[PDB]
Design an enzyme around this catalytic site. Structure first.
Site, short mmCIF file in Angstrom:
data_model
loop_
_atom_site.label_atom_id
_atom_site.label_comp_id
_atom_site.label_asym_id
_atom_site.label_seq_id
_atom_site.Cartn_x
_atom_site.Cartn_y
_atom_site.Cartn_z
N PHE A 25 2.02 -3.48 0.77
CA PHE A 25 1.78 -2.08 1.13
C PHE A 25 2.42 -1.72 2.46
CE2 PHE A 25 -0.87 1.41 -0.43
CZ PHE A 25 -0.86 2.27 0.66
N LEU A 28 6.12 -1.47 1.85
CA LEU A 28 6.24 -0.23 1.08
C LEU A 28 6.22 0.99 1.99
CD1 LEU A 28 6.12 0.46 -2.14
CD2 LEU A 28 3.76 0.91 -1.74
N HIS A 29 5.31 1.00 2.97
CA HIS A 29 5.25 2.08 3.95
C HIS A 29 6.52 2.13 4.80
CE1 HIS A 29 4.52 3.72 7.94
NE2 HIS A 29 4.50 2.49 8.42
N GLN A 30 7.04 0.97 5.20
CA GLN A 30 8.27 0.95 5.99
C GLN A 30 9.48 1.39 5.17
OE1 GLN A 30 7.34 -2.83 7.74
NE2 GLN A 30 8.36 -2.33 9.68
#
Length: 187
Positions: A25, A28-30
């Site tokens: 996650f 994924l955010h980066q």
RNA sequence: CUAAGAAAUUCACGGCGGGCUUGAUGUCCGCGUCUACCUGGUUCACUGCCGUGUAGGCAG
């Protein structure tokens, strides 16, 4: 959103799956910070709201070109030994829809003390009598434990899947994949 | 349907005077404690912003 990709956490002795979903996650955010956009959503089709678990699956929803782009980027470098890939395919028909919302709490009273004493120039005791220690809210939602890069702080983020609807409406998404009006197909 | 069934102890008081416990002493020889380990179990419930708002969200 028409296309979904299922990535499964490979079962690992060296780390529990909560830590792998945490780092997945986070990267994924980066990656969503690096691409931008608000039409890219997430879902967790291995939900279990009895024990408040997130399971082992991650389903990312967008178009075809976005998913085939996100396959070939270095946000999957250093992780591809620890997870399995799927194929970007169409959502089948018919499916319900639901949201992915971030639900925080004011479970820390001290931040509310700092807020009420920094905007009003109160004392410690006036802030203590204004808002008591019973303001801490308890949650039974699944969570992901991510850290920060520049000014490093590790926090748990609670995910709430909303009610199952029959039709979806328009709306954006954050860099976390969370719903801001746009709903993901649940299947 | 019980060796059942029942019950008021209580009033008052001066224990104190006195004293030398002392002399003397070798604890001591000897000793293998070892072998092997994921502190993470999400275990840092944080920091700041918009909003009059504690109502609601956001950003890392």
């Amino acid at each position: 959103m028409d296309h979904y990709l299922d990535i499964r956490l490979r079962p690992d002795p060296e780390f529990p799956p909560a830590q792998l979903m945490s780092v997945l996650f986070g990267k994924l955010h980066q990656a969503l910070v690096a691409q931008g956009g608000d039409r890219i959503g997430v879902s967790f089709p291995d939900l279990d709201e009895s024990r408040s678990r997130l399971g082992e699956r991650l389903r990312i929803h967008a178009s075809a070109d976005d998913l085939r782009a996100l396959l070939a980027r270095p946000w999957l470098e250093g992780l591809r030994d620890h997870l399995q890939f799927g194929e970007p395919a169409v959502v089948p028909h018919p499916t319900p829809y639901r949201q992915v919302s971030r639900v925080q709490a004011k479970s820390n009273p001290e931040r509310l003390r700092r807020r009420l004493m920094r905007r009003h120039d109160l004392s410690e005791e006036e802030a203590r009598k204004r808002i008591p220690d019973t303001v801490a809210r308890t949650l039974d939602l699944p969570f992901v434990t991510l850290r920060s890069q520049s000014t490093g702080q590790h926090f748990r983020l609670f995910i709430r899947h909303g009610p199952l609807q029959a039709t979806a409406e328009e709306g954006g998404f954050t860099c976390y994949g969370l719903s801001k009006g746009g709903f993901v197909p649940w299947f």
